[PDB]
Design a protein around this ligand. Structure first.
Ligand SMILES: CC(=O)N[C@H]1[C@@H](OP(=O)(O)OP(=O)(O)OC[C@H]2O[C@@H](n3ccc(=O)[nH]c3=O)[C@H](O)[C@@H]2O)O[C@H](CO)[C@@H](O)[C@@H]1O[C@H](C)C(=O)N[C@@H](C)C(=O)N[C@H](CCC(=O)N[C@@H](CCCCN)C(=O)O)C(=O)O
Ligand SMILES: CC(=O)N[C@H]1[C@@H](OP(=O)(O)OP(=O)(O)OC[C@H]2O[C@@H](n3ccc(=O)[nH]c3=O)[C@H](O)[C@@H]2O)O[C@H](CO)[C@@H](O)[C@@H]1O[C@H](C)C(=O)N[C@@H](C)C(=O)N[C@H](CCC(=O)N[C@@H](CCCCN)C(=O)O)C(=O)O
Ligand SMILES: [Cl-]
Ligand SMILES: [Cl-]
Ligand SMILES: [K+]
Ligand SMILES: [K+]
Ligand SMILES: [Mg+2]
Ligand SMILES: [Mg+2]
Ligand SMILES: [Mg+2]
Ligand SMILES: [Mg+2]
Lengths: 490, 490
């Protein structure tokens, strides 16, 4: 369409040049701007992209949105606005015909479990033979087609384009992980949600939020941003075992569905039986109690599957059909995955990377340790270290602990492993600057019948290194390649 | 319509009896429930209205919404739900066909100035000859028809009925004051806003919110609850002279318009000239700067009229037509009103009742005191007293200060005046247990050419007394009746 119609949506603007031109693309990355693109400049943590306006002109782009008039050829139209990214989200949703209004959208937020719940909703939808899309830490997925991305919640234009791709591919629904960063930073401006789901709130991301207070209020935006139109069928799904759910109630008018294991809720799990192969439980609901078989491991994953079932049920699918669909659901990549059970050791990978997520992981694996628990964990570079010794303490619930860096970036890897080491409660631990080296060591130390857990990365395919350069790395592959060498069964 | 269709909007319910019945009314007050009403029970601060279910049955009501099965005749249908008031707002907006979707709705929140801004928007709309409604501290107004009410933001059912009355009366827009209580307590569930306006945030209501933190987050709900549909023409209007506006930006995607006098903003007031008769100023806007004449007194009222003009402009009315409409706008009742200027004293009433609102009032009146400033203020009963000595301090900017109770309820009136007295900085003050007696005294003490200010009630027609019984009381009438006696000019 033409720039003219797009910019009628912006009341405060100084327009320098014609808006008669056709527009088919928008971008906040200058490297992809061309004729027919709007390039929207912004000030990032690293660079100020106003500086690349001359590049997009060179590349054919005839329209930039800026916060200050730039030096450009006369024939490039400039639209000067007070808040360029705000305008970016308005222009994006407009250009792509409001993609989040065009399908059912589920949003999941919380400190741990976002990937698990969001992926479980997508997998249920697929099992029911409905087209579905997923966006989050594992990247972007339409039905069974995956690509990897840089964020859990990508910047507004990329994110909006991805919702449009899901609509164009014929998705009937889409599920998004909603990071607390994404919310605060405006990454989700324009994204209408139909169901908002909460997992839990425990200390994380305080290098960004400053306080627990601010962190929780950040996550409440998913709930309050549902809005106020009570003709719409929207729903909220809350964990009654987390005390922040009481606050979440208050920020939204839509009907709330609660789930719980430890505290009373509308939906509960009773009579729980655990195995490394999955769980069974009695699913108390307001309409009756039903036996559920789930392939996922542990109680934390029972909270998670409950959230996912309730989310899908809320939009009109019978509980009986959901419960049946859950039985042979595929593993969630990198989230409590038991690797090749033909190995003579239990080899398990998981993304847990805060003290609370580690306790849930260890709680789930521990009843099944027959001999020694060998536990590897990483601490992330350039993050709040306040609870890192505490991660170290929690790791020491294991018999043998390996400390590694995880995406150390420009931080000294020794600094991070030393920080974890501060909380260790026995002498049975060891630190490696190189995580691949650390995994090969956990295999070396492991006996037949031992349990080995690799925590904090799952199948994440890179280590962020100095310069913020991504280097290939795969806990699962490194661990398997080393476990076959040591145990056979290649 | 029938209960059947209404309750399809509620997913979790236990229905005891038929829903075949016709429903034309909903109520959370048992005293108005009858045949065709839904009575929704709830637990209040005073009583639990579940107890009156037998009364509504006696009165003919055949449908109650409860949080627990009650003792009732068999032919009364009960719908048992986990959150009765949440369901009340859903049922109400449904029954009345979503009244807030049916007109343009402006919402105003902030510690001081809500009544001023909200009333100024209504008055502009009327001046432009458009049907308009107002709801807030001065009660409910359709065009020029007024009724008084008990709250600034009434409980959900009353509030929703009032929006419906405005729609039925043909209102093209409606403006609501949005109290921080109303937001937290769910009074505004279902109410779609098109424009959200912020005045300021300073200490108040902490007996309810506990912290400034929680108090500000409460008010952010108006902004975040606008939602995420960027096809809708919604706008946010923020005061750049208040540092909470920086936080408000972040909780909403809609375009933001800023106003300011002390700090840079998109809309500013320059070259300000003041009189007891009104102000003139240069109104800097993004489209040019225009001379404005306003009937309201002081700089705080210039922030207020700016917010109101920008709100009306945002929905498509030209600034030139608004600016012309503003010139002879009617006084806002109880908000910096200069009473009979034929009196030989300046007699002024105002609602200011926190330390910050008092400073703004005194700032506005002071340049015009020719002799002595005689200042009367009340402290409210059963409220946080932490800043009350500070109100006492601020009052003592006057030459002679009268301390009174304001709605003392069950609090000792001496306790409240004594608390104000704690902050007094000179010996020229006096305390009265009876506020009428106090006003008659301010007249006694006043000379020709003095300024008398009555603060904290405006034209509020009652004193809440022991038992929470309202007794008639009117600062304006009591003051005028006493000023005529003393000065003549009946
Ligand atoms: C600190 C931060 O926010 N930088 C995000 C931000 O960078 P910058 O602001 O530095 O970008 P830069 O300054 O280069 O560019 C600004 C703008 O200029 C543009 N530009 C730039 C260069 C150029 O030549 N041309 C051009 O047009 C560019 O497109 C952008 O529009 O903009 C990028 C693009 O959108 C994101 O990809 C970054 O995200 C990084 C990867 C991140 O790590 N972000 C973290 C903070 C994050 O967002 N986390 C959440 C939650 C996930 C999480 O935090 N997980 C844990 C996991 C820990 C365990 C790991 N196993 C963690 O990482 O701590 C999320 O991903 O949604
Ligand atoms: C503490 C509080 O919230 N009680 C509000 C609340 O009472 P209760 O919970 O005690 O009601 P109660 O317990 O009796 O009844 C519960 C339920 O049972 C029902 N019910 C009751 C009796 C019955 O026989 N049958 C029946 O069906 C009834 O309709 C209700 O649905 O429900 C009423 C009805 O909806 C409101 O009218 C009250 O509001 C009062 C007046 C108030 O003062 N509220 C304050 C806290 C307030 O809301 N303030 C804000 C902001 C304005 C403000 O605070 N201004 C300052 C002004 C100070 C300067 C003054 N010059 C202040 O007052 O401090 C606002 O009004 O939006
Ligand atoms: Cl509940
Ligand atoms: Cl601004
Ligand atoms: K949607
Ligand atoms: K509206
Ligand atoms: Mg997180
Ligand atoms: Mg995730
Ligand atoms: Mg207030
Ligand atoms: Mg008010």
């Amino acid at each position: 369409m033409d720039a003219s119609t797009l910019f009628k949506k912006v009341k405060v603007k100084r327009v320098l040049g014609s808006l008669e031109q056709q527009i088919d693309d928008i971008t906040t990355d200058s490297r992809t701007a061309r004729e027919g693109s709007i390039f929207v400049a912004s000030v990032g943590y690293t660079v100020d992209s106003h500086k690349f306006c001359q590049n997009v002109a060179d590349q054919g782009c005839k329209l930039v949105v800026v916060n200050k008039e730039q030096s450009l050829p006369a024939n490039v139209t400039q639209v000067v606005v007070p808040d360029t990214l705000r305008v970016a989200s308005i222009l994006a949703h407009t250009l792509y015909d409001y993609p989040s209004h065009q399908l059912v959208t589920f949003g999941v937020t919380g400190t741990n479990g976002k990937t698990s719940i969001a992926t479980m909703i997508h997998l249920i939808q697929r099992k029911l033979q409905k087209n579905s899309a997923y966006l989050g830490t594992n990247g972007f997925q339409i039905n069974e087609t995956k690509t990897k991305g840089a964020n859990t919640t990508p910047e507004t234009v990329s994110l909006t384009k991805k919702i449009k791709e899901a609509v164009d591919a014929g998705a009937e629904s889409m599920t998004l992980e909603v990071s607390s960063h994404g919310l605060v930073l405006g990454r989700l401006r324009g994204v209408e949600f139909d169901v908002a789901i909460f997992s839990n709130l425990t200390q994380d991301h305080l290098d960004f939020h400053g306080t627990m207070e601010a962190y929780g209020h950040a996550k409440s935006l998913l709930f309050s941003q549902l809005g106020e139109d009570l003709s719409k069928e929207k729903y909220v799904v809350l964990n009654n075992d987390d005390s922040f759910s009481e606050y979440l109630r208050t920020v939204t008018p839509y009907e709330v569905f609660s789930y719980g294991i430890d505290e009373e809720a509308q939906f509960m799990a009773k009579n729980i039986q655990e195995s490394l192969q999955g769980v069974s439980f009695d699913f108390v609901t307001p309409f009756g109690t039903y036996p559920v078989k789930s392939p996922y491991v542990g109680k934390f994953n029972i909270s998670n599957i409950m959230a996912a079932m309730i989310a899908v049920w809320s939009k009109g699918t019978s509980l009986e059909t959901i419960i049946k669909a859950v039985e042979n659901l595929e593993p969630v990549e990198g989230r409590l995955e038991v690797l090749d059970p033909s190995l003579p050791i239990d080899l398990i990978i998981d993304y847990a990377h805060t003290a609370d997520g580690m306790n849930k992981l260890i709680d789930a694996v521990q009843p099944f340790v027959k001999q020694k628990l060998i536990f590897l964990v990483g601490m992330a570079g350039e993050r709040d270290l306040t609870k890192t010794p505490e991660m170290g303490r929690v790791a020491c619930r294991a018999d043998y602990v390996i400390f590694t860096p995880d995406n150390p970036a420009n931080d000294d890897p020794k600094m991070l492993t030393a920080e974890l080491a501060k909380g260790a409660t026995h002498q049975n631990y060891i630190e490696f600057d190189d995580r691949a080296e650390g995994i090969k060591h956990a295999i070396d130390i492991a006996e037949p019948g031992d349990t080995v857990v690799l925590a904090s990365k799952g199948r994440e395919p890179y280590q962020i290194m100095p310069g913020h350069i991504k280097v290939p790395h795969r806990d699962d592959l490194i661990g398997l390649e080393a476990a076959y060498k040591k145990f056979g069964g290649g």
